[PDB]
Amino acid sequence: DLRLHLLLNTSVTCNDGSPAGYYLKESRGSRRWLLFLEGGWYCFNRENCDSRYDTMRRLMSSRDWPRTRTGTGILSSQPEENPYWWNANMVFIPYCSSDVWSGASSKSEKNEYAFMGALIIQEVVRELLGRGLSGAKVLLLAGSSAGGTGVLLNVDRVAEQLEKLGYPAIQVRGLADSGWFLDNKQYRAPTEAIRRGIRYWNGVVPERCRRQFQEGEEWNCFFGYKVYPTLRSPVFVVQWLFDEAQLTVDNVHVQEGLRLYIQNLGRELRHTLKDVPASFAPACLSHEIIIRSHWTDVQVKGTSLPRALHCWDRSLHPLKGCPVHLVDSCPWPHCNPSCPT
Numbered sequence: 544d545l546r547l548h549l550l551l552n553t554s555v556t557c558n559d560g561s562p563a564g565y566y567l568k569e570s571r572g573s574r575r576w577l578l579f580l581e582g583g584w585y586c587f588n589r590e591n592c593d594s595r596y597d598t599m600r601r602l603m604s605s606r607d608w609p610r611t612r613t614g615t616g617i618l619s620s621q622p623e624e625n626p627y628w629w630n631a632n633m634v635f636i637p638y639c640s641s642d643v644w645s646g647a648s649s650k651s652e653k654n655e656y657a658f659m660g661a662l663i664i665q666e667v668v669r670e671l672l673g674r675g676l677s678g679a680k681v682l683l684l685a686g687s688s689a690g691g692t693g694v695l696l697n698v699d700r701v702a703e704q705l706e707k708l709g710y711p712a713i714q715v716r717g718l719a720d721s722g723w724f725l726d727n728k729q730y731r732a733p734t735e736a737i738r739r740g741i742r743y744w745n746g747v748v749p750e751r752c753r754r755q756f757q758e759g760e761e762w763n764c765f766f767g768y769k770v771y772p773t774l775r776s777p778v779f780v781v782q783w784l785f786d787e788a789q790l791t792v793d794n795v796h797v798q799e800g801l802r803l804y805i806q807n808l809g810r811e812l813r814h815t816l817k818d819v820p821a822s823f824a825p826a827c828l829s830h831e832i833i834i835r836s837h838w839t840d841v842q843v844k845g846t847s848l849p850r851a852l853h854c855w856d857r858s859l860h861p862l863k864g865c866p867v868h869l870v871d872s873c874p875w876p877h878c879n880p881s882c883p884t
């Protein structure tokens with residue numbers, strides 16, 4: 544199991560002012576570190592954050608967190624469950640900031656809630672350097688859903704943090720799972736909700752992307768195909784072609800009109816990944832995968848996701864029989880027989 548540590552700097556807080564934290568299982572024979580960002584949507588004004596505090600409070604507060612968590616999927620220490628990185632040092636960072644890991648605002652006389660996701664990541668990294676991270680060869684920042692978008696927003700800032708602190712030898716990389724969305728036309732909106740969120744959170748985006756889109760337009764950097772070309776750290780993108788959260792925001796729940804909509808969505812997502820050299824994108828209706836225990840089951844062109852990630856590792860030392868770019872071409876959900884049931 545992974546053991547809970549609340550942050551020693553208690554000014555870095557969850558939404559309600561309680562300390563943020565992380566779950567850790569050390570592997571003293573390994574110089575690889577996996578830091579995973581939890582997901583779970585977000586809230587963008589006082590009224591909908593109040594609702595979330597009533598019935599999704601573990602995503603806003605550490606008051607009720609358990610002392611341990613079992614590592615699953617890519618966070619498992621068993622080679623049978625995790626062929627990729629079973630011997631790595633494992634970290635799970637709970638999502639308690641409701642800001643897609645972008646915020647830098649404290650609770651105050653003028654703010655009912657604190658939104659400190661970007662600062663939580665920074666503080667976890669700093670405290671881990673005293674526990675063994677200082678000796679690392681590779682730090683893989685991973686995440687699912689809102690945490691997958693969080694990887695895209697934060698991987699280059701972690702790389703800059705470690706450089707400025709005097710650790711140029713640690714290679715920082717990103718793994719974004721189910722966080723690559725389209726700002727597309729709905730079947731019957733994310734952009735306006737994210738625009739309001741950034742102002743409510745004092746949200747921050749990567750510097751090069753901010754400089755392209757400029758003031759008032761930072762919401763663009765929450766969309767994978769717009770922020771990814773601005774990033775310097777290596778990033779592997781995992782994305783279902785028919786993501787259930789994408790379909791929810793598109794108001795989709797089969798006649799000709801809906802058939803054409805769904806096929807066009809799959810084609811648009813394929814297009815945005817054409818020039819992403821490390822990626823895994825199966826033609827399935829699902830959401831998240833990398834901390835699911837049966838993440839080993841799905842394959843594209845005969846290659847599993849743990850295998851693709853291992854091939855990525857080798858590429859960062861094309862490879863015969865070890866591909867890193869894997870995108871399905873068939874045009875309908877479950878045209879891949881290995882899709883989750």
Ligand SMILES: Cc1ccc(CN(C)Cc2ccccc2)o1
Pocket residue numbers: 582583584585643687688689690692722724733737765788789792
């Ligand atoms: C279960 C879950 C957590 C987060 C999400 C994705 N959801 C579309 C939120 C989002 C993320 C990034 C950008 C815009 C919106 O699903």
Ligand SMILES: *[C@@H]1O[C@H](CO)[C@@H](O)[C@H](O)[C@H]1NC(C)=O
Pocket residue numbers: 552554555662
């Ligand atoms: C705690 O975190 C805050 C916000 O990031 C920072 O301003 C402060 O310097 C930190 N305290 C210490 C002792 O590092």
